[PDB]
Amino acid sequence: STIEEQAKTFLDKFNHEAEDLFYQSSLASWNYNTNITEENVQNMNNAGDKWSAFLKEQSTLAQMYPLQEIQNLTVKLQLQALQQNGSSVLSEDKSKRLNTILNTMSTIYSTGKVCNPDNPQECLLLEPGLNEIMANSLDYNERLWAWESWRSEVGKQLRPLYEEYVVLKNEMARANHYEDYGDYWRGDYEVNGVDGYDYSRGQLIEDVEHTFEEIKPLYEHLHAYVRAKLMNAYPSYISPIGCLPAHLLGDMWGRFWTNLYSLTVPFGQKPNIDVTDAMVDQAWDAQRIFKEAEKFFVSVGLPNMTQGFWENSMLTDPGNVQKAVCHPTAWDLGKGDFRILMCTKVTMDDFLTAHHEMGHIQYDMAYAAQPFLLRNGANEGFHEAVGEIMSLSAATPKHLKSIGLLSPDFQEDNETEINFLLKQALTIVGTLPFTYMLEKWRWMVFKGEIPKDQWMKKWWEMKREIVGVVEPVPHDETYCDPASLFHVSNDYSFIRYYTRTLYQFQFQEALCQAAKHEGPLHKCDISNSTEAGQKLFNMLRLGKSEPWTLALENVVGAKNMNVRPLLNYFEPLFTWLKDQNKNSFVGWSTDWSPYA
Amino acid sequence: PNITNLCPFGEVFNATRFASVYAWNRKRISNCVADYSVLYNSASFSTFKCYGVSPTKLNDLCFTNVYADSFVIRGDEVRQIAPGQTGKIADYNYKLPDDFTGCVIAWNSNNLDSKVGGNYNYRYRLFRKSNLKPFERDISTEIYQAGSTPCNGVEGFNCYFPLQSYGFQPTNGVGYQPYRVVVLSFELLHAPATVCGPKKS
Numbered sequence: 001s002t003i004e005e006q007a008k009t010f011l012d013k014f015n016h017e018a019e020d021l022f023y024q025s026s027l028a029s030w031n032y033n034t035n036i037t038e039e040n041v042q043n044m045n046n047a048g049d050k051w052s053a054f055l056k057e058q059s060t061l062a063q064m065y066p067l068q069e070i071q072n073l074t075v076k077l078q079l080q081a082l083q084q085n086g087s088s089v090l091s092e093d094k095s096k097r098l099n100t101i102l103n104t105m106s107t108i109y110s111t112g113k114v115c116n117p118d119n120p121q122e123c124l125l126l127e128p129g130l131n132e133i134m135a136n137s138l139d140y141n142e143r144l145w146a147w148e149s150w151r152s153e154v155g156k157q158l159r160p161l162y163e164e165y166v167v168l169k170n171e172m173a174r175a176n177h178y179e180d181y182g183d184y185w186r187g188d189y190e191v192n193g194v195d196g197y198d199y200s201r202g203q204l205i206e207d208v209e210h211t212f213e214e215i216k217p218l219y220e221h222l223h224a225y226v227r228a229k230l231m232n233a234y235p236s237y238i239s240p241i242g243c244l245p246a247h248l249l250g251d252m253w254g255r256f257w258t259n260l261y262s263l264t265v266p267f268g269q270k271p272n273i274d275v276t277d278a279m280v281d282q283a284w285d286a287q288r289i290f291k292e293a294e295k296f297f298v299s300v301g302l303p304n305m306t307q308g309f310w311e312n313s314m315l316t317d318p319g320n321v322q323k324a325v326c327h328p329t330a331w332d333l334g335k336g337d338f339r340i341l342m343c344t345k346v347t348m349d350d351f352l353t354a355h356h357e358m359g360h361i362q363y364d365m366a367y368a369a370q371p372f373l374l375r376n377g378a379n380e381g382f383h384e385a386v387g388e389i390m391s392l393s394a395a396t397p398k399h400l401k402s403i404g405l406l407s408p409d410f411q412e413d414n415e416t417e418i419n420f421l422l423k424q425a426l427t428i429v430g431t432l433p434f435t436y437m438l439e440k441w442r443w444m445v446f447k448g449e450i451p452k453d454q455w456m457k458k459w460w461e462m463k464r465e466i467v468g469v470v471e472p473v474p475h476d477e478t479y480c481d482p483a484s485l486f487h488v489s490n491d492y493s494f495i496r497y498y499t500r501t502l503y504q505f506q507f508q509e510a511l512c513q514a515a516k517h518e519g520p521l522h523k524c525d526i527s528n529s530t531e532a533g534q535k536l537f538n539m540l541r542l543g544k545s546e547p548w549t550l551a552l553e554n555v556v557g558a559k560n561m562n563v564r565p566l567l568n569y570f571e572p573l574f575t576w577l578k579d580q581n582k583n584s585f586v587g588w589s590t591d592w593s594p595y596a
Numbered sequence: 597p598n599i600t601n602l603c604p605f606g607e608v609f610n611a612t613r614f615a616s617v618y619a620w621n622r623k624r625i626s627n628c629v630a631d632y633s634v635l636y637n638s639a640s641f642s643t644f645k646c647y648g649v650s651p652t653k654l655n656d657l658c659f660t661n662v663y664a665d666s667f668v669i670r671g672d673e674v675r676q677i678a679p680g681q682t683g684k685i686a687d688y689n690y691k692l693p694d695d696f697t698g699c700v701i702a703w704n705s706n707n708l709d710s711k712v713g714g715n716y717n718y719r720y721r722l723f724r725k726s727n728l729k730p731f732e733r734d735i736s737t738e739i740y741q742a743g744s745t746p747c748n749g750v751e752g753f754n755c756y757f758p759l760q761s762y763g764f765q766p767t768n769g770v771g772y773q774p775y776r777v778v779v780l781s782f783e784l785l786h787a788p789a790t791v792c793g794p795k796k797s
């Protein structure tokens with residue numbers, strides 16, 4: 001009869017025929033990931049082509065129902081999600097060119113092998129050949145060689161490809177009534193039609209700048225401390241007044257600073273909170289790791305894992321004969337099938353990763369009651385944030401003492417809390433200016449603020465201005481230094497990490513206030529608290545049915561992303577860094593004073 | 597006295613194949629001895645929810661006829677086999693009256709009714725113009741008209757085929773695994789009641 005009932009019946013037919021097909025595609029992807037064999041690659045490609053063709057035909061059918069004649073918010077949300085053209089609005093030649101460009105960038109990044117000139121008989125791939133060198137070497141020219149050689153080969157291959165990529169993606173986005181591809185990425189946070197809780201695509205950039213302006217003093221103090229310690233590690237290269245050299249940050253790109261914890265530790269003489277040896281002494285299997293994670297999630301009141309999870313997940317490396325991807329991934333395959341693919345070792349990192357991925361699984365299980373096309377996070381930030389809050393809670397010394405993994409006579413003084421907070425800052429605070437600068441640069445590239453002949457002059461200028469990191473030697477326009485990273489070369493949004501980082505501490509303050517923790521925020525553990533789990537699960541059960549602003553009201557009581565919980569989390573470390581920076585100079589100069 | 601001629605509950609519960617929920621099988625059970633304690637004391641049933649009568653006095657009471665309706669649904673759809681419920685199964689496939697006397701027995705059948713490729717031998721009705729009357733069977737395969745335009749017998753736009761297949765894989769969750777449901781309907785009519793329980797010696 002009416003248009004709304006027609007759309008509801010069409011959505012019922014869609015959910016019905018898109019659930020089994022998504023399950024087939026996800027099962028084929030799982031069988032490829034647990035068994036890397038060429039027939040599994042072919043089965044994955046066939047299932048993916050069937051899924052994409054079915055989505056094209058259903059979007060084509062879906063557009064015939066106009067949006068403004070539908071008043072139910074959930075039906076309008078599913079119809080908005082389905083009616084996106086994607087690349088279908090673009091011409092078939094240009095769509096094939098875009099798909100070819102994406103595939104060849106994926107192959108160039110995955111099979112990129114770089115080694116030293118005049119010694120070409122064997123070469124090292126990025127993982128783990130170059131990762132280990134970047135994370136563990138203490139030699140200036142070796143890290144400089146690895147960094148410049150990988151950006152030479154990868155950037156000089158990827159620069160014309162990226163120049164084609166920006167034009168094709170802008171053409172596709174403006175064909176979809178967006179300003180640019182950056183507006184297309186910012187449309188994930190767009191809320192329209194809800195009174196008061198509306199969020200605009202243009203408000204995202206303003207909110208990110210407004211939060212980063214409050215990030216900036218803490219990052220400046222952390223940068224000054226890291227500069228002083230790296231000056232101690234490398235005596236003559238680092239200037240007291242200038243930026244940090246790019247190849248010394250502990251990672252390939254400067255994404256995280258967590259590999260500088262050995263060099264920049266405050267109190268090395270004091271012990272660490274490493275629990276690896278304790279699990280080795282008690283012979284903790286990976287099954288025991290996941291069962292302890294399940295005990296954590298049942299202590300907070302969330303549902304425990306299904307029988308199909310324990311039967312069908314791969315929680316251990318299979319062996320030499322069977323090949324599998326080593327990256328930890330939680331899979332929502334569909335039809336109530338939830339699995340974790342992790343090559344779990346007996347380490348703290350794998351235990352925290354088990355908590356993180358089971359948090360992903362809990363988030364996926366919570367919105368299983370929702371319709372199929374609404375089975376996602378409210379935005380891209382929440383899905384990662386709910387795993388990172390479990391990583392926060394499990395890493396606390398109270399949780400380790402509670403489960404017996406840490407000695408009950410371990411002394412928790414202020415120095416261990418300072419060095420733990422510094423490790424968490426190197427992981428968490430250090431990625432924020434890099435993430436913000438990368439997304440702002442990509443937004444200005446898509447918007448046309450930066451011409452193609454001026455991409456790198458602006459980019460290093462942005463890095464000196466925001467991240468406080470200087471290039472070792474100048475790069476011309478033959479280089480493509482951003483696209484050496486996984487997310488930018490493979491068409492992924494990058495603001496999800498910034499939003500994830502702020503949502504992480506907002507959720508942490510909300511659940512710790514729910515759990516009635518009476519101390520510092522970093523000493524807070526959300527186990528044994530049914531009300532914290534209930535406050536979490538109220539948002540978790542919604543999925544994408546409600547706006548992310550309303551979900552954030554449901555958890556923290558605020559309608560917008562907020563920066564104060566992060567600053568409250570690192571406040572002991574902030575006071576300690578302000579005490580330690582009396583003699584040194586906070587801030588950097590954008591000039592070429594150390595080296596260029 | 598000594599009792600023989602038990603009611604054929606083996607051909608209902610232990611059947612090699614069950615019907616689809618749109619075409620649910622109805623078996624009329626008459627003139628035999630119905631021993632209900634064999635069913636109640638079984639550990640193989642997940643749901644044994646009886647409405648209008650208790651299972652303990654079933655083996656005592658006597659009824660004129662017993663209607664055994666058998667079908668297969670999903671795990672999350674077992675709750676809709678109840679008086680007063682709402683859903684695809686209750687509205688469009690199998691409707692129970694509000695004044696229902698009988699028992700709803702359901703059990704997981706992932707072992708039998710799921711194959712690795714996917715068992716699509718079980719269809720449900722997804723669309724009908726109106727809700728079903730209680731104990732009604734709809735086996736029509738006429739194209740559902742959701743729009744003003746005539747379908748003309750072809751599945752195009754706003755015109756859908758009303759019967760849709762279940763996807764049953766053994767790796768599915770418990771809310772998507774197949775459940776065999778047998779509904780027993782007990783009525784007393786003015787004819788002499790012949791389906792009686794076993795009498796103790």
Ligand SMILES: *[C@@H]1O[C@H](CO)[C@@H](O)[C@H](O)[C@H]1NC(C)=O
Pocket residue numbers: 035037322
């Ligand atoms: C992985 O693939 C090989 C190649 O066909 C197959 O023999 C093996 O059974 C597979 N592994 C599992 C666990 O099924």
Ligand SMILES: *[C@@H]1O[C@H](CO)[C@@H](O)[C@H](O)[C@H]1NC(C)=O
Pocket residue numbers: 072073074075
């Ligand atoms: C929107 O539709 C859903 C069914 O898809 C229904 O449960 C919900 O109540 C509707 N909301 C409104 C406001 O009509």
Ligand SMILES: *[C@@H]1O[C@H](CO)[C@@H](O)[C@H](O)[C@H]1NC(C)=O
Pocket residue numbers: 063083084085089176177
């Ligand atoms: C998708 O592309 C078609 C083709 O021009 C267009 O008519 C339709 O409005 C587009 N949909 C959206 C949501 O932009």
Ligand SMILES: *[C@@H]1O[C@H](CO)[C@@H](O)[C@H](O)[C@H]1NC(C)=O
Pocket residue numbers: 304305306307
């Ligand atoms: C999950 O919790 C329920 C409730 O106690 C329990 O019956 C079930 O056995 C648990 N699941 C597993 C796999 O142990």
Ligand SMILES: *[C@@H]1O[C@H](CO)[C@@H](O)[C@H](O)[C@H]1NC(C)=O
Pocket residue numbers: 414415418576
């Ligand atoms: C820890 O507390 C003691 C006593 O208040 C103080 O002397 C010391 O400087 C503190 N250390 C740090 C790292 O804050």
Ligand SMILES: *[C@@H]1O[C@H](CO)[C@@H](O)[C@H](O)[C@H]1NC(C)=O
Pocket residue numbers: 299398402527528
């Ligand atoms: C949480 O509950 C378990 C079981 O009741 C208990 O062993 C554990 O000590 C509790 N955690 C804390 C921090 O009290």
Ligand SMILES: *[C@@H]1O[C@H](CO)[C@@H](O)[C@H](O)[C@H]1NC(C)=O
Pocket residue numbers: 605606609610635638640
């Ligand atoms: C059906 O099969 C089960 C499985 O062994 C058996 O225990 C039972 O006696 C059979 N008959 C009935 C009527 O349930």
